[PDB]
From a paper:
All receptors described to date interact with these Atg8-proteins through a conserved tetrapeptide motif called LIR motif (LC3 Interacting Region).
The asymmetric unit of the Nix-LIRS34,35E-LC3B2–119 complex contains two molecules (molecules A and B) and the Nix LIR portion in each molecule interacts with its symmetry-related molecule (molecule A and B bind to symmetry-related molecule A and B, respectively). The binding mode is similar to previously reported LIR/LC3 complex structures. The electron density of the N-terminal Nix region (PPAGLNEE) is weak compared to other regions or invisible. In our X-ray structure, it is Arg10 side-chain participating in intermolecular hydrogen bond to the phosphomimicking Glu34. We present here the first atomic detailed structure of phosphorylation-based regulation of interactions between mitochondrial autophagy receptors and Atg8 homolog proteins.
Residue numbers in the entry:
A (entry chain B): 10 to 134
B (entry chain A): 9 to 134
């Protein structure tokens, strides 16, 4: 009654922090200026406690990079021990084809907004 | 409905007629892996067309950055057109308004369900 609570207590994902048309606009600008890159959002699964939070959320991935190279890149950015379990979920599932360019993966897995969303965790769910 | 179907003269098969939907889905998979920064474009002459010649080659891997207005110039040159000859490059039956955006951008709005981008060239806009 005395103090007014603003916003919602829970951390918002990227998708949740931006309007659908903001997102669609962000992608337009990327496809226009970085036409050989794929726009990828990369977030730590909500309940995660073994893995650190990435420094950044918004990435541009060269068409040619495959999922296994991406996994290795993110493991290194996060400075993981080689023994630490790590999964990179694309729409809630690990990708089977880890040697196909992300430009191809993008065509099957991209969101309606044009972004490709990934979530990393120490369990595969 | 008692109206007649006036069949066209069967000519050379188009790309979709030569290949099944699954062979084309498979072709796109290969091509996307082999050329991740290119768009696979099928470019064929409008079946009704008289003014413009037929090009020998119909299957083009276009670099993502290339725009529609660069692509048009490429095709007008391969056809060896006179500079006054009307020419249109139709995507799903229409001229593209956006003529200095990357073809990779176009692709995402206009691609066929099989994953190829189809175009048809004509001396009228239809």
């Amino acid at each position: 009654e005395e103090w007014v609570e603003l916003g919602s207590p829970s951390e918002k994902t990227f998708k949740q922090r931006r309007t659908f048309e903001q997102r669609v606009e962000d992608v337009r600008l990327i496809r226009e200026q970085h036409p050989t890159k794929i726009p990828v959002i990369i977030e730590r699964y909500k309940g995660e406690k073994q893995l650190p939070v990435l420094d950044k959320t918004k990435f541009l991935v060269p068409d040619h990079v495959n999922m296994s190279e991406l996994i290795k890149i993110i493991r290194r950015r996060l400075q993981l021990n080689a023994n630490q379990a790590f999964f990179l979920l694309v729409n809630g599932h690990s990708m089977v084809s880890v040697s196909t360019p992300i430009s191809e993966v993008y065509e099957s897995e991209k969101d309606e907004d044009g972004f490709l969303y990934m979530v990393y965790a120490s369990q595969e769910t």
